[PDB]
Write a protein that binds this ligand. Sequence first.
Ligand SMILES: O=C(O)CCC(=O)C(=O)O
Ligand SMILES: [Cl-]
Ligand SMILES: [Zn+2]
Length: 275
Amino acid sequence: ALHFLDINATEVKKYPTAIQDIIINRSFDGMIIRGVFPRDTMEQVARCLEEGNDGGMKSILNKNEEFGTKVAQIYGHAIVGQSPDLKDYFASSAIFRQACRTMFQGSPDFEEQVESIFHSLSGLPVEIPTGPEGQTYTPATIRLLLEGREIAVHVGNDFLLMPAANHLKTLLDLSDQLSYFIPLTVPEAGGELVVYNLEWNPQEDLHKYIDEVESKFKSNQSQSVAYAPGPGDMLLFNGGRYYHRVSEVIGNSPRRTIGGFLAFSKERNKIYYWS
Ligand SMILES: O=C(O)CCC(=O)C(=O)O
Ligand SMILES: [Cl-]
Ligand SMILES: [Zn+2]
């Protein structure tokens, strides 16, 4: 039942209602957009991180050691699992934007490239949502997935019913939250995005959430598709509706991705993207 599209970033303007078709029409569920960022740009950013000349990106690195092998280490705080006050979230968001802008060196700039992609797929203006006191949300976060580590099965729409999304929920339309990511570094094997035909149910603590989803996902039978995008390719899929995960990274070479989420504004006149 799951349908994805394999298109190049040079033909995004040929699909002007893509985001509309996934969220509202539900005619197709995912999109793999090849060559959004060049391979050299992805190599240079990855090299900036591992060497430490990252514009202070390492200062907002969350090892997530309190969890198991079923989560990624993350550069900046992701909205998921944050406390409802968002004080730490908003401070890391500002550090992220600056450090990310520095690493990309406008070759192309991460924020404007991605925004021009979401705008090409909608025809609507693309913005990073603002907090209650005018603070910026982070446009994305960098997920570092080491050997033996994976991103455990979850569904995206569950996140907008959590206390951290209390303010953001009021800015968005009552519809499916899309999920996006672009690999910086890809592993030798593993680190695949496995998407299941299984759907989110409204009436059905991150440590508790991981254990709850896994126990319910255990019983249910579903169809699966696997995607391993290359460095610079965008994977824009209905992560809000469909249960998905990232398989165990095989080999010494780690998996590094820059991504987040996107959903329509209350009046469907704007696109909001964050992490
Ligand atoms: O690989 C990533 O960056 C996160 C994958 C994922 O679970 C998502 O995009 O929703
Ligand atoms: Cl998600
Ligand atoms: Zn996800």
